[PDB]
């Protein structure tokens, strides 16, 4: 009996290191997975991204936190909305 997304209470507009890594090279899989769909490639990016020694992620996460920090800084100001029943309207 109420709608709600990831806008109120800790907004998550920016992208994640895995996103800027997946969505960025996804093209590399959409072009190399002619006999597949996307689940096959997706699994591939889930193995590499994790395997990463956090040596390169520190850069990505620093890119995700760089904006999420300045964004949520003044953007989160709208989080004043205390009343928020079950925040999850993703079907």
Swiss-Prot record:
It is found in: Nucleus, Nucleolus. It is linked to Neurodegeneration, childhood-onset, with brain atrophy: An autosomal dominant neurodegenerative disease with onset in childhood, characterized by progressive cortical atrophy, developmental delay, developmental regression, loss of motor skills and ambulation, absence of language, and intellectual disability. It comes from Homo sapiens. This is Nucleolar transcription factor 1. Homodimer. Part of Pol I pre-initiation complex (PIC), in which Pol I core assembles with RRN3 and promoter-bound UTBF and SL1/TIF-IB complex. Interacts with TOP2A in the context of Pol I complex. Interacts with TBP. Interacts with TAF1A. Interacts with RASL11A. Binds to IRS1 and PIK3CA. Interacts with DHX33. Interacts with PHF6. Interacts with CEBPA (isoform 1 and isoform 4). Interacts with DDX11. Interacts with NOP53. Interacts with ALKBH2. Phosphorylated and activated by PIK3CA. Transmembrane segments: none annotated. Recognizes the ribosomal RNA gene promoter and activates transcription mediated by RNA polymerase I (Pol I) through cooperative interactions with the transcription factor SL1/TIF-IB complex. It binds specifically to the upstream control element and can activate Pol I promoter escape. It comes from the Eukaryota. Residues 11-79 bind DNA.
């Amino acid at each position: 009996m109420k709608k709600l997304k990831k806008h109120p209470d800790f907004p998550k507009k920016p992208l994640t290191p895995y996103f800027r890594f997946f969505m960025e090279k996804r093209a590399k899989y959409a072009k190399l997975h002619p006999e597949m769909s996307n689940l096959d490639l997706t699994k591939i990016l889930s193995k590499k991204y994790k395997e990463l020694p956090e040596k390169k992620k520190m850069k990505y996460i620093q890119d995700f936190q760089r904006e999420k920090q300045e964004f949520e800084r003044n953007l989160a100001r709208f989080r004043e909305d205390h009343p928020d029943l079950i925040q999850n309207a993703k079907k």
